[PDB]
Amino acid sequence: VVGGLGGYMLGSAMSRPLIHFGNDYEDRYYRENMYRYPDQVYYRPVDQYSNQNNFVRDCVNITVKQHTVTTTTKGENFTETDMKIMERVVEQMCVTQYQKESEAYYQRGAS
């Protein structure tokens, strides 16, 4: 079943990302089985700015929102603690999706 998201595009797939929170519980909490989460995010042609603030932060909020509405339709809730990780991991995906091929076109950063 899928019937609630529909606004933004569909960004390229990848591996499960993993950010260094360095708190070992907090790391484990995802390192356990995190592959169950999506490994794509939802973006828009931003142009001009490319990679300023809202490029990632808006893309996080949209991705989050296409799940908050989902969960509101489903009958579930998240934690602030999950959301801390979720934000970092979706934030990373919204950068890394752009760094796949958008960064070959737009932007730079060989080192």
Swiss-Prot record:
Subcellular localization(s) per the UniProt record: Cell membrane; Golgi apparatus
GO BP, sorted A to Z: protein homooligomerization
Lipid-binding residues (covalent, GPI-anchor amidated alanine): 110
Keywords from the UniProt entry: Amyloid, Cell membrane, Copper, Disulfide bond, Glycoprotein, Golgi apparatus, GPI-anchor, Lipoprotein, Membrane, Metal-binding, Prion, Repeat, Signal, Zinc
Origin superkingdom: Eukaryota
Glycosylation sites: 51, 61, 77
An example molecular function term from Gene Ontology annotations: copper ion binding
Annotated S-S bridges: 59-94
Gene Ontology CC annotation, any one: side of membrane
Biological function: Its primary physiological function is unclear. May play a role in neuronal development and synaptic plasticity. May be required for neuronal myelin sheath maintenance. May promote myelin homeostasis through acting as an agonist for ADGRG6 receptor. May play a role in iron uptake and iron homeostasis. Soluble oligomers are toxic to cultured neuroblastoma cells and induce apoptosis (in vitro). Association with GPC1 (via its heparan sulfate chains) targets PRNP to lipid rafts. Also provides Cu(2+) or Zn(2+) for the ascorbate-mediated GPC1 deaminase degradation of its heparan sulfate side chains.
Subunit structure: Monomer and homodimer. Has a tendency to aggregate into amyloid fibrils containing a cross-beta spine, formed by a steric zipper of superposed beta-strands. Soluble oligomers may represent an intermediate stage on the path to fibril formation. Copper binding may promote oligomerization. Interacts with GRB2, APP, ERI3/PRNPIP and SYN1. Mislocalized cytosolically exposed PrP interacts with MGRN1; this interaction alters MGRN1 subcellular location and causes lysosomal enlargement. Interacts with APP. Interacts with KIAA1191. Interacts with ADGRG6.
Disease: PrP is found in high quantity in the brain of humans and animals infected with the degenerative neurological diseases kuru, Creutzfeldt-Jakob disease (CJD), Gerstmann-Straussler syndrome (GSS), scrapie, bovine spongiform encephalopathy (BSE), transmissible mink encephalopathy (TME), etc.
Protein family: Belongs to the prion family.
This protein's domain notes: The normal, monomeric form has a mainly alpha-helical structure. The disease-associated, protease-resistant form forms amyloid fibrils containing a cross-beta spine, formed by a steric zipper of superposed beta-strands. Disease mutations may favor intermolecular contacts via short beta strands, and may thereby trigger oligomerization. Contains an N-terminal region composed of octamer repeats. At low copper concentrations, the sidechains of His residues from three or four repeats contribute to the binding of a single copper ion. Alternatively, a copper ion can be bound by interaction with the sidechain and backbone amide nitrogen of a single His residue. The observed copper binding stoichiometry suggests that two repeat regions cooperate to stabilize the binding of a single copper ion. At higher copper concentrations, each octamer can bind one copper ion by interactions with the His sidechain and Gly backbone atoms.
Protein name: Major prion protein
UniProt source species: Canis lupus familiaris (Dog)
